[PDB]
Design an enzyme around this catalytic site. Structure first.
Site, PDB file in Angstrom:
ATOM      1  N   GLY A  66      -0.467  -5.729 -11.977  1.00  0.00           N
ATOM      2  CA  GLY A  66      -1.587  -4.727 -12.109  1.00  0.00           C
ATOM      3  C   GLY A  66      -2.339  -4.751 -13.508  1.00  0.00           C
ATOM      4  N   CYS A  69      -4.297  -7.300 -14.268  1.00  0.00           N
ATOM      5  CA  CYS A  69      -5.491  -8.344 -14.136  1.00  0.00           C
ATOM      6  C   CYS A  69      -6.470  -7.356 -14.394  1.00  0.00           C
ATOM      7  CB  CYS A  69      -5.807  -8.813 -12.816  1.00  0.00           C
ATOM      8  SG  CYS A  69      -4.226 -10.169 -12.294  1.00  0.00           S
ATOM      9  N   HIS A  77     -10.941 -11.934  -7.669  1.00  0.00           N
ATOM     10  CA  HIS A  77      -9.989 -11.995  -6.679  1.00  0.00           C
ATOM     11  C   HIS A  77      -9.448 -10.488  -6.432  1.00  0.00           C
ATOM     12  CE1 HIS A  77      -6.567 -10.961  -9.366  1.00  0.00           C
ATOM     13  NE2 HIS A  77      -7.002 -11.787 -10.307  1.00  0.00           N
TER      14      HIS A  77
HETATM   15  C1  LIG Z   1       3.107 -14.664 -11.378  1.00  0.00           C
HETATM   16  N1  LIG Z   1       2.416 -14.502 -10.318  1.00  0.00           N
HETATM   17  C2  LIG Z   1       2.426 -14.751  -9.106  1.00  0.00           C
HETATM   18  O1  LIG Z   1       3.597 -14.832  -8.823  1.00  0.00           O
HETATM   19  C3  LIG Z   1       1.502 -14.509  -7.949  1.00  0.00           C
HETATM   20  N2  LIG Z   1       0.108 -14.573  -8.374  1.00  0.00           N
HETATM   21  C4  LIG Z   1      -0.788 -15.939  -8.708  1.00  0.00           C
HETATM   22  O2  LIG Z   1      -0.156 -16.949  -8.767  1.00  0.00           O
HETATM   23  C5  LIG Z   1      -2.048 -15.838  -9.065  1.00  0.00           C
HETATM   24  C6  LIG Z   1      -3.058 -16.906  -8.907  1.00  0.00           C
HETATM   25  C7  LIG Z   1      -4.149 -16.743  -9.215  1.00  0.00           C
HETATM   26  C8  LIG Z   1      -4.788 -15.511  -9.698  1.00  0.00           C
HETATM   27 CL1  LIG Z   1      -6.547 -15.239 -10.224  1.00  0.00          CL
HETATM   28  C9  LIG Z   1      -3.963 -14.314  -9.795  1.00  0.00           C
HETATM   29  C10 LIG Z   1      -2.512 -14.258  -9.408  1.00  0.00           C
HETATM   30  C11 LIG Z   1      -1.692 -13.226  -9.633  1.00  0.00           C
HETATM   31  C12 LIG Z   1      -1.176 -13.042 -10.922  1.00  0.00           C
HETATM   32  O3  LIG Z   1      -0.795 -13.960 -11.485  1.00  0.00           O
HETATM   33  N3  LIG Z   1      -0.998 -11.842 -11.601  1.00  0.00           N
HETATM   34  C13 LIG Z   1      -0.448 -11.621 -12.829  1.00  0.00           C
HETATM   35  C14 LIG Z   1      -1.281 -11.587 -13.643  1.00  0.00           C
HETATM   36  N4  LIG Z   1      -0.509 -11.273 -14.921  1.00  0.00           N
HETATM   37  C15 LIG Z   1       0.635 -11.166 -15.067  1.00  0.00           C
HETATM   38  C16 LIG Z   1       1.606 -11.122 -13.808  1.00  0.00           C
HETATM   39  C17 LIG Z   1       3.119 -10.747 -13.866  1.00  0.00           C
HETATM   40  C18 LIG Z   1       3.842 -10.753 -12.820  1.00  0.00           C
HETATM   41  S1  LIG Z   1       5.399 -10.394 -12.877  1.00  0.00           S
HETATM   42  C19 LIG Z   1       6.220 -12.032 -13.025  1.00  0.00           C
HETATM   43  O4  LIG Z   1       5.859 -10.146 -14.423  1.00  0.00           O
HETATM   44  O5  LIG Z   1       5.666  -9.601 -11.815  1.00  0.00           O
HETATM   45  C20 LIG Z   1       3.088 -11.125 -11.648  1.00  0.00           C
HETATM   46  C21 LIG Z   1       1.935 -11.177 -11.571  1.00  0.00           C
HETATM   47  C22 LIG Z   1       0.960 -11.211 -12.689  1.00  0.00           C
HETATM   48  C23 LIG Z   1      -0.462 -13.445  -8.480  1.00  0.00           C
HETATM   49  C24 LIG Z   1      -1.068 -12.915  -6.942  1.00  0.00           C
END
Ligand SMILES: CNC(=O)CN1C(=O)c2ccc(Cl)cc2[C@H](C(=O)Nc2cncc3cc(S(C)(=O)=O)ccc23)[C@H]1C
Ligand SMILES: CNC(=O)CN1C(=O)c2ccc(Cl)cc2[C@H](C(=O)Nc2cncc3cc(S(C)(=O)=O)ccc23)[C@H]1C
Ligand SMILES: [Cl-]
Lengths: 305, 305
Positions: B143, B145, B41
């Site tokens: 960040g 990932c 991704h």
């Molecule tokens: C919570 N995520 C989102 O709102 C949006 N989101 C996804 O849904 C997504 C879906 C499939 C893939 Cl393969 C990747 C993602 C991403 C994702 O999940 N990345 C993150 C990874 N680990 C931890 C995180 C933590 C945060 S936070 C809630 O601490 O800001 C925020 C994103 C984090 C993004 C684009």
């Protein structure tokens, strides 16, 4: 999201661990530049441990009595000296893996990572805190002496602990890297015991702010407290007194969540009285005290949920 | 003495972490030999994540579209390919710090160390388990990932997890290093949720053996049970079924303490049916399930790497 007991990456410290042997005793040493730091009790036999005279044991030693092994390479000792409870072995080779470092003496309540080692070889890494009674609740077996505690804020390693002993209650005691013990302990196999321990109040408050940042507010209430009334109640639960310094230190977390420190103190007072009633806070059924205000800021997001 | 959630020393993995950037997206990569592994991704914009056609997004990219940074040195990408949900970037330089390694797929209940990274720079290390619902309860921000999970056996690093996403409940999902997800998850921003989780029974039993080794026996009783009677009890409290394989695996801990596995099951049956009654086990008011039988043996024996 999430909240874990997180240690610093241990690579910079693994590259400094060596094995130190003096006769039949083997323990760990920290190799920085051309000096190997290790507990001075490496020069003791089991008989020597009751009332060792370190100055008299050390004067009978020469450089070749100390065997220092870095991986599979033998280092040559060209000098030795004692500084408090640490032995400093001057070697002929400077460690090419020496990171940027400092020696720091920490205060009770402060946290650090421990790289547990055996025979100069790292086995594991875990997060620890200096307890109010100056002991640490570590996980150490025989052969772990010389294992170190550290923090790595930025790219600099700040060494704060060197492991010397385990007390009868299973807790651990050691020194800073200048060989000064934390607590009223001595490197003697004499009757020694950890004093009554207390809970690190400022750390529990910091962890309650971490729960609020992660979206949990069930424990908040409409009350406030004066600092003195909070301390009069908290001390009845063996909690450390909360000082004005601790209140100032909680300022940034208070501003990020919009919850005044004395307002969070009221919530802690109520949590102590009621317990959790089947609930958990950040995956724990107890009030956690081994995360500092600085650790929560380090780990949590700057945006409250 | 002592029992801590211990991670493996992270040095061998820190030397493999790099930063990968494709347009406006930046995440972490794992640099082994002349290949950088990262979540596929990285080639997606925010609009693409809603419904990405990865083969189509990838065909529009050239090698110079990928910026790989190892410390302060830019690596040159000379090839790219996709394997499941992982992108493999062929680079012109083989990593001189490449350790001895294997890619392994773990089963639910197994534990591993996570080296959390941001911008190709390691920030922390923690231990966690693959939950029965295939999620991990990690600690990850935006960040993170491309951060990896691993175990160490002697000098060989077995990479088992690469971080891809966070679910709405704050738990995490990812793949093995071949890009196959753990769990029924997909790499797109669609309605996804963690299934109902269960407790890892064999791990709770292992942690009860660890408590006995550390001098805690209050939960022991004269009673025994059968696998059939205990499994009805486990099913009622959302505990995973205990198999004959799990019983055989607990054999060494059973022999070290003198407590038969079905005898320890009788203790867990009573703890489930009545609680702890104000008492704690290894400093916890909950039954801990993120230590495997092997983790208990390794920590209570001092195995080094
Ligand atoms: C919570 N995520 C989102 O709102 C949006 N989101 C996804 O849904 C997504 C879906 C499939 C893939 Cl393969 C990747 C993602 C991403 C994702 O999940 N990345 C993150 C990874 N680990 C931890 C995180 C933590 C945060 S936070 C809630 O601490 O800001 C925020 C994103 C984090 C993004 C684009
Ligand atoms: C528990 N202690 C002992 O049986 C004997 N003992 C001491 O009392 C002592 C006193 C002052 C100094 Cl400076 C050094 C020591 C040593 C010590 O404490 N070393 C250890 C350190 N960390 C962890 C340990 C763990 C164990 S155990 C009980 O898990 O096998 C066993 C020794 C461990 C030895 C000689
Ligand atoms: Cl401090």
């Amino acid at each position: 999201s999430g909240f874990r007991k997180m240690a610093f990456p241990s690579g910079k410290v693994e590259g400094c661990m060596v094995q130190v042997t003096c006769g039949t005793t083997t323990l760990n040493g920290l190799w920085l530049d051309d000096v190997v730091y290790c507990p001075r009790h490496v020069i003791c036999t089991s008989e020597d441990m009751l009332n060792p005279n370190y100055e008299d044991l050390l004067i009978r030693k020469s450089n070749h009595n100390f065997l220092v092994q870095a991986g599979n390479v033998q280092l040559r000792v060209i000098g030795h000296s004692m500084q408090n409870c640490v032995l400093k072995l001057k070697v002929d080779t400077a460690n090419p893996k020496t990171p940027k470092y400092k020696f720091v003496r920490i205060q009770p309540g402060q946290t650090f990572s421990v790289l547990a080692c055996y025979n100069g070889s790292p086995s594991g890494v875990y997060q620890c805190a200096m307890r109010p009674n100056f002991t640490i609740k570590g996980s150490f077996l025989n052969g772990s002496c010389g294992s170190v505690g550290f923090n790595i804020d930025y790219d600099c390693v700040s060494f704060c602990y060197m492991h010397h002993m385990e007390l009868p209650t299973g807790v651990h005691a050691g020194t800073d890297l200048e060989g000064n013990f934390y607590g009223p302990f001595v490197d003697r196999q004499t009757a020694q015991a950890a004093g009554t321990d207390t809970t690190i109040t400022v750390n529990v408050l910091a962890w309650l702010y971490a729960a609020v940042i992660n979206g949990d507010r069930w424990f908040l209430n409409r009350f406030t407290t004066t600092l003195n009334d909070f301390n009069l109640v908290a001390m009845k639960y063996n909690y450390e007194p909360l000082t004005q310094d601790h209140v100032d230190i909680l300022g940034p977390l208070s501003a990020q969540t919009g919850i005044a420190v004395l307002d969070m103190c009221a919530s802690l007072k109520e949590l102590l009285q009621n317990g959790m009633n089947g609930r958990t806070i950040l995956g724990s059924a107890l009030l956690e005290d081994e995360f500092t205000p600085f650790d929560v800021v380090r780990q949590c997001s700057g945006v409250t949920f």
